[PDB]
Amino acid sequence: ATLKDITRRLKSIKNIQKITKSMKMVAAAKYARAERDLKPARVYGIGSLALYEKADIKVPEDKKKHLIIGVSSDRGLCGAIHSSVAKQIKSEVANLTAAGKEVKIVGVGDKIRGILHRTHSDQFLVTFKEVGRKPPTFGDASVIALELLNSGYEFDEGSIIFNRFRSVISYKTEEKPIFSLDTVASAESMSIYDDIDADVLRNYQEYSLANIIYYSLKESTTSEQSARMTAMDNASKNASEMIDKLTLTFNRTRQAVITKELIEIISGAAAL
Template identity: 80%
Template sequence: RNMATLKDITIRLKSIKNIQKITKSMKMVAAAKYARAERQLKPARVYGTGSLALYEKADIKAPEEKAAKHVIIGVTSDRGLCGAIHSGVAKTIKSEIANLTGAGKEVMVINVGDKLKALLHRTHGKHIMLNCKEIGRKPPTFGDASVIAAELLNSGYEFDQGSVIFNRFRSVISYKTDQKPIYSIDTVANSGKSMGIYDDIDADVLRNYQEFTLVNIIYLALRESSTSEQSARMTAMDSASNNASEMIDKLTLTFNRTRQAVITKELIEIISGAAPVDNHSVNWSLAVPLETTRCCSVIRNVRSSSPTQQPAFTCKVVLLYV
């Protein structure tokens, strides 16, 4: 039984060491991707902030009585092993759906990434309008944002307003779930006095600007989410590697203690199995190493009074730890 236990511990130690190698490799890859994503995030923030300037300066808002259709774009990725970064977006979307449907409004969701689809499909499947895959395998580009925006505009769903929900990058160990507003062309064009500060706005110009703004906001969300994901994965893999090191140390200690108990038990069985007979004396000793820094010395004293008589064994065990 003890030998089986030692074998099990050895197998588990080997598997944990292999997992630790994987987590360390993933941490290094995530660190390289994070450095690249952080550099590319700065220009994306400039584009996104500039595109939102029209909404902020003109104070564009959809009238409450007309804002009956909402669209939510949730941005995650196809990959995991990055903590609770995807579940945070899903939780926010579920809360928004509950609030809007409670107010009697129609809500549809566009899932960006398979992870978000898996989190929403079972409980909010009827609200899902589109699913966008192959996100997160490569760094996001402006073309990816254009495809998502085109799918939304060509879907036939005439929304009044909506929001893009994503993880906003704050630092290498911190991110926050954030959302940016989006509006339909009709909502922007019918803003009345809010748009009066802009003279001679052609309908085509307004449409082009609205589409460009939508793409820029989605692109900003993709960049923010990608940077947050890589930083979260780097942190998660670092924690996993540290936990693996602790488990290896504990299992190594357990293995050494179990091996020591096995050797001690076998020595006791050998010694107790020697039956005493007549007085015949022989002196011999046996040393068995327990660990690299320990040794066990067994001294047996055997006495005999006559060579014709059968030997009588008397044994004494002395354990010396160095």
């Protein structure tokens, strides 16, 4: 193209590169904070799931209802985090609906709502937003669990899907079952456990639901920050490559313009 178009495109790409690098640094800082905060959250989640790890608490047979908790954030530019969790929740919804079980889904991330609203709009139970803008904490998870119970959808079987943080570059979209129903909590192992009663076990199960929601939120935010940093770094690298290519093109165009104008001047002078 002309010199002006090349200059405009080069300056725009330079600005985009600067913004992407700044966002990469911001995401690196947020990833460091999330990594620091993950360890107590990791211990808390492992402790919460320890009871169901040491007891063969398995759903006996088919159940009419089923709640899917898709933990995600509202921000974009996270790469394939939201894509992976959406694929996992879609696959789980299809698999559980093939058995004729009523499927309802709760998405704490507005991105999940946007992705699944084209098809799974009716299956939305309660949608939450403003996730990932600030580091998640147990208060938000408690509110989510409170309104999940208050939603009136008494799901006999439940599950939660989240992106577990494995490393700075690797994450796993993990699915964890949730036995929120009081009856499914009681099993052969609860015979050994003392003071089980009915109400105490119900409150314990609700608190365990809150705990797993919090743990999934922490893992998801750590994975999201890591993926945000990686994606911003890749975008910055691509922008720099485009910048150097356009710089070479701009130098060629500038030299061509100078030569052309000088040739015009020389021809005009000689033809006089």
